[PDB]
Paper text:
The hLL-3717–29 fragment was suggested to serve as the active core of the AMP, showing a different spectrum of antibacterial activity as compared to the full-length protein and other fragments, including being the shortest LL-37 fragment retaining anti-viral activity. Here we demonstrate that the active core peptide of hLL-37, containing residues 17–19 (hLL-3717–29), formed supra-helical highly stable fibrils that interact with bacterial cells.
The gorilla LL-37 (gLL-37) sequence contains two amino acid substitutions when compared to hLL-37, with one at position 17, the first residue of LL-3717-29, substituting phenylalanine with serine (corresponding to a F17S mutation). gLL-3717-29 exhibited slightly weaker antibacterial activity against M. luteus compared to hLL-3717-29, with a MIC of 53 µM, similar to the effect of the F17A mutant. The N-termini of the helices, with Phe17 in hLL-3717-29 or Ser17 in gLL-3717-29, and Lys18, line the central pore. The pore of gLL-3717-29 is more occluded, due to the orientation of the lysine residues extending into the pore. Similarly, the mean MIC value gLL-3717-29 (equivalent to an F17S mutation) is 53 µM.
Numbering used by the authors:
A (entry chain B), B (entry chain A): 1 to 13
Amino acid sequence: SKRIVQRIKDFLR
Amino acid sequence: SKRIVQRIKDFLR
């Protein structure tokens, strides 16, 4: 899921 | 990416 990956990336940035 | 999600899930299991 692109949505899920981007959410994790944004949480950790 | 389904693969990327599954990679993260597997790393944390």
